[PDB]
Amino acid sequence: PDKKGYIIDIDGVIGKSVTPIPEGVEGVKKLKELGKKIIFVSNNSTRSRRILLERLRSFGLEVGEDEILVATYATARFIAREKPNAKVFTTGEEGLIEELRLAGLEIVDYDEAEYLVVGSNRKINFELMTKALRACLRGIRYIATNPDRIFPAEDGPIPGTGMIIGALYWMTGREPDVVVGKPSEVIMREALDILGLDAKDVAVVGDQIDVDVAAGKAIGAETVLVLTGVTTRENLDQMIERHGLKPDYVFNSLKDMVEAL
């Protein structure tokens, strides 16, 4: 399982929200120590890159800007490259808006936008869905931060960004033109470019078969599933069957993966 680089999912691997998984932290540290290059990749739809940077550092990890690729930032830079200073309307929360502005984009009303940017919003309401609907029906280019349907939260499942995607699809027939987040190749090819590595020299590590393992197959990188998050020893067979994908390796935690090098 020995590679030049590692594309590492954060949630379920290194932390759970603000709480570090000690075996995941340890594993990262041992990886840096062995001189492996790492990029942390997250589908987080709502927080800016620097929040997640600051979070990893609060876990005790030594991490620079360029080692963090989060969907809010990935999405903003994808647009900006395509169309410098593009006029955008988003359904998303402050951290997405932040990354949009940080990439030089201009935030406008739904009827002036050249891009519709769909990200999750805990403040989603009828007015905001009306605006998205109207933007989508105007036929403007339509980007989504991530496809995730449901987030397994504290008190139970809650809607993810796929809720807005599904609503717009049902009403208009349009899916997004581009989905940025895992398992899309968009965020994955950005991570490779950042690493300066070919897929053949990279492994993709994560806690979800349908997100992280799918992401790795699509760029032709070897895949490692850890059992510190959504996938457990008790549901692994079920998840393999459910998603029709197998990881190249399974480890209890990132620490254990690293002990095998």
**Residue 200 interacting partner from a second copy, Ca ion, none (CB closer than 5 to 8 Å by kind):** none
Minimum CB–partner distance for residue 216 and Ca ion (Å): 13
109 annotated as a binding-site residue: no
Minimum CB–partner distance for residue 151 and a second copy (Å): 10
Q: Is 11 one of the binding residues for Ca ion (CB under 5 A)?
A: yes
Cα distance between residue 32 and residue 128, in whole Å: 43
Q: According to CB under 8 A, which one of 102, 107, 108, 133 is a site residue for a second copy?
A: 133
> 171 with 130: CB under 8 angstroms?
no
Residues in the chain, how many? 261
Two structure tokens written together for 50: 């620097």
Give the count of residues interacting with a second copy (CB under 8 A): 29
Q: Is 109 one of the binding residues for a second copy (CB under 8 A)?
A: no
Pairing of strands 15-16, 19-20: antiparallel
Question: Please, which residues have CB within 8 angstroms of residue 109's CB and are 6 or more apart in sequence?
Answer: 89, 131
**Residues 62-91, mask of contacts with a second copy (x by CB under 8 A):** ------------------------------
With contacts defined by CB under 8 A, name the span among 81-89, 158-166, 177-185, 240-248 that binds a second copy: 158-166
List, in sequence order, every residue forming a beta bridge with 89; answer none if it has no partner: 116
Question: Please, which residues have CB within 8 angstroms of residue 87's CB and are 6 or more apart in sequence?
Answer: 105, 106, 107, 108, 112, 113, 114, 115
Backbone angles phi, psi at 179, to 5 degrees: -105, 125
Q: According to CB under 8 A, which one of 19, 64, 125, 154 is a site residue for a second copy?
A: 125
Tell me, what amino acid is at 65? Answer: E
Minimum CB–partner distance for residue 175 and a second copy (Å): 10
User: Which residue ranges make up the site for a second copy (CB under 8 A)?
Assistant: 121-126, 129-130, 133-134, 137, 149-150, 156-160, 162-172
